[PDB]
Amino acid sequence: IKRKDASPEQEAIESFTSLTKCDPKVSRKYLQRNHWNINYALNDYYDKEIGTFTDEV
C-alpha cells in the first residue's frame, strides 16, 4: 500500500538504501533478515559490509 510517499517497504528501504548508499533490492535482503526492522537491519549490514574495514590494518 503505497502511501504516495513511503510504501510499507519503502519506509524502511528508501531510508536504509539512502543511509547505506546501496541498491533498494539490497536493503530488501537485509530487512528480510531482521523482520524489516531498520535498526536491526543496519547493524547486520554494518556487520557484513562495514565489518571488514580492517583490510588495511
CATH of the domain at 34: 1.10.8.10
CA–CA separation, 19 and 47 (whole Å): 15
Range of the domain at 33: 1-57
At which residue does the C-alpha cell 510504501 appear? 7
The CA distances from residue 13 to 7, 20, 53, 56, 57, in Å, are 9, 10, 24, 31, 32
What total of structural domains would you count in the chain? 1
C-beta atoms surrounding 12 within 10 Å: 21
How many Cβ atoms sit within 10 Å of the Cβ of residue 38?
16
Neighbours of 5 (CB within 10 A): 8
What nine digits make up the cell of 46? 554494518
